[PDB]
Design a protein around this ligand. Structure first.
Ligand code: SF4
Ligand SMILES: [Cl-]
Lengths: 268, 255
């Protein structure tokens, strides 16, 4: 992918990864950029808040024409969401067989087959961070920066440590660098900060999704489409700064992943 | 040629706690247990041996991919009540299929014939993704026990695990033995699944003690002995041979 800044939003599930991913796309669109969010999570609900409905996955449409990306139209797997944010979700691989790199590989293949990347200025990959195998690490081959999503619990810090090693493994042969980590919502961050100081990482922003912003409205609309109040405007500003920082570049860092055993003795 | 079960389910919902106590349950029942932790976070056998045992990929890292001079003392460790257990370890971060790690941890066991004496084998497989790589333990498993909870993510993962066992059963011997953990019961009725039991260790017992040692090794109290009976009743129920069932998977839009 060329001619567009690509960011891979990593992080494990259950912490609101799709929330921080879809709002970053909407924040880029507020700043006047053409955004294109690629949903790579098996749970194809990353672009739900952008479109307002379940977008048909690319693998669902490809499994209808017997794997022939010829009769497919751009309006069959790419849908326009809030503020013109183009939404395409790869979906999950077949249950039991098939690889994740195939679902990610075919999505980018049709995006370049129909020339659906010449107009987009920002590409947002929402990638599952629960595993860091080469199949789900495929969006790192196209991304410029990789912002990881993490929470204060142990499983998120363990996944973040696994993504740091995965991105830096791809960093030796690809342009992808680690831009830092982002707390999922405004809570305690002492355990995340201690991991950053030990790994020479860094935490970026801190969105206030915990205070108010009822989960029913979180997963329904995006923050830039909700009605304005104190908490919405405060959370909107946290995503505008994150989008602007990633746009005009950040000062590079050189983190390192702790061994899988040294992270247990760090937290517990 | 022995009974083998695959503990499947999403992470963070105490799946490793379920697979560990299930292994120790078969041990108390007088069975040779072999728990193979396939989770990338190789903490499946933490409560058994009391320590983070070296993984297969970590041994092959300082062994230069050479399974020549490898002995059972390197990767297989003696756990609680004589439970042999080995962590397969996570795939290399960035590149490397999960099926390769599962494929290289079963050949290292068959190379030494460490299965001609065991009776029950427990597979702790990560259920966050139901891709073909992580679905490799389903090929050998006789049945698969799903770990879930009342949240959406655990039910969504269980719904994809059922579809993963269905497709894998068309060419293998894997079956669906049910699930363990209100809203889950509404899922089983629509999918014709089965809700086995429910271990009551969320309250009174401390997750710190849960992640420390197995329930069969803790100090004998009222709450831990009631939890031992739940895992003992589950171990014998699987050994007796539960009445098989054919659950169907739901579309992702319907789930
Ligand atoms: S590369 Fe990853 S997604 Fe693909 S089969 Fe292997 S473990 Fe599964
Ligand atoms: Cl709308």
């Amino acid at each position: 992918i060329t001619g567009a800044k690509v960011f891979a939003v990593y992080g494990k599930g259950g912490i609101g990864k799709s929330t921080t991913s879809s709002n970053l796309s909407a924040a880029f669109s507020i700043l006047g950029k053409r955004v294109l969010q690629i949903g790579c999570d098996p749970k194809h609900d990353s672009t739900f808040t952008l479109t307002g409905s379940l977008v048909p996955t690319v693998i669902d449409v490809l499994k209808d024409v017997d794997f022939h990306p010829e009769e497919l139209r751009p309006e069959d797997f790419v849908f326009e969401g809030f503020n013109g944010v183009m939404c395409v979700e790869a979906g999950g691989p077949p249950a039991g067989t098939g690889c994740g790199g195939y679902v990610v590989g075919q999505t980018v293949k049709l995006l370049k087959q129909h020339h659906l990347l010449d107009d987009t200025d920002v590409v947002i990959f929402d990638v599952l961070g629960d595993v860091v195998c080469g199949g789900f690490a495929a969006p790192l081959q196209h991304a410029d920066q990789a912002v990881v999503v993490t929470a204060n619990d142990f499983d998120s810090i363990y996944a973040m440590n696994r993504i740091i090693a995965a991105v830096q493994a791809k960093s030796k042969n690809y342009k992808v660098r680690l831009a830092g980590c982002v707390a999922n919502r405004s809570r305690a961050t002492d355990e995340v900060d201690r991991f950053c100081k030990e790994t020479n990482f860094r935490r970026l922003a801190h969105m206030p999704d915990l205070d108010a912003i009822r989960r029913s409205r979180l997963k329904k609309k995006t923050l830039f489409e909700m009605d304005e109040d104190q908490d919405v405007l405060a959370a909107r500003a946290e995503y505008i700064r994150l989008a602007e920082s990633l746009w005009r570049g950040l000062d590079p860092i050189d983190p390192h992943s702790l061994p899988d055993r040294e992270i247990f003795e760090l937290l517990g």
